[PDB]
C-alpha cells in the first residue's frame, strides 16, 4: 500500500501551489494568495505501468519566516523538489540553499542518493522577462548532484505532468 510523501520547497512566489494544483486538480489562477500553514493534496499514480503508488504532495509558504510547521515540513519525505521562477535570479540563486535546508531537515542517510528534482516554473512569461537561462539551470542541476530539471508552467500545463512523474518514480525508488 505504497504512500509517497514529495515535498514542494522554493522562495515566495515561484509557483509551488500552482504546479501542485496544476498537477492535482488541473487548476490554475492568475489570482497570487500566500500560503499560510502546510497541507498536501493526494495524487494516485503509477510507475512503470505496474507499480501502484499514492503520492501525498506538501505545499507551505516559500519564505522560511512563514513556515508555520517547521522541521515537521521535511520529516520522512521520499523525494523534494525544488522550484524556482525563470524571471526571478534571486528564487534560482537559492535552490542550493533549499536542497540544503532539506538534507539537515530531513536527516538523510545518502545524501548523493537522495532524490531532488529542479522546476524551472513560469516558461509561459514574456521572453524578456526570462532571466534565469536554461544552460544556467542544467549547470546547477549537474553540480548537485545530476539531478533532474524540467522547466515547467503551472499556468499552460507545460511539462507538469512529465516532471510529477519522475518525481514519483524517484519516490517510489527512494521508498523502496
Ligand atoms: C493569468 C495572468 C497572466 O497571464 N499573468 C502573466 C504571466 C503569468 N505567468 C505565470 N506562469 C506560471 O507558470 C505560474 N505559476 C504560478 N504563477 C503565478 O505566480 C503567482 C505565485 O503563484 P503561487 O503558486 O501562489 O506561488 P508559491 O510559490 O505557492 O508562493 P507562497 O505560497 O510560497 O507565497 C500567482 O499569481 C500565480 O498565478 C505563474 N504565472
Ligand atoms: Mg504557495
Ligand atoms: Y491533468
Ligand atoms: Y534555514
Ligand atoms: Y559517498
Sequence with gaps: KNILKVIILGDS???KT?????????????????????????????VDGDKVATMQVWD??????????????????????????????????????????FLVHANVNSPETFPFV????????????????EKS?????????DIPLFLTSAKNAINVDTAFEEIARSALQQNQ
Design 13 to 15: 512566489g515561484v509557483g
Design 60 to 101: 507551505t509558504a516559500g519564505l522560511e519566516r512563514f513556515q508555520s510547521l517547521g522541521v515537521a515540513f521535511y520529516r520522512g519525505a521520499d523525494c523534494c523538489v525544488l522550484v524556482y521562477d525563470v524571471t526571478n535570479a534571486s528564487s534560482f540563486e537559492n535552490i542550493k540553499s533549499w536542497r540544503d535546508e
Design 18 to 46: 500552482s504546479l501542485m494544483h496544476r498537477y492535482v486538480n488541473d487548476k490554475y489562477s492568475c489570482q497570487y494568495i500566500a500560503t499560510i500553514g502546510a497541507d498536501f493534496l493526494t495524487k494516485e499514480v503509477t
Design 137 to 145: 539551470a542544467q549547470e546547477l542541476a549537474k553540480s548537485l548532484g
Design 118 to 133: 529542479i522546476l524551472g516554473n513560469k516558461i509561459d512569461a514574456e521572453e524578456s522577462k526570462k532571466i534565469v537561462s
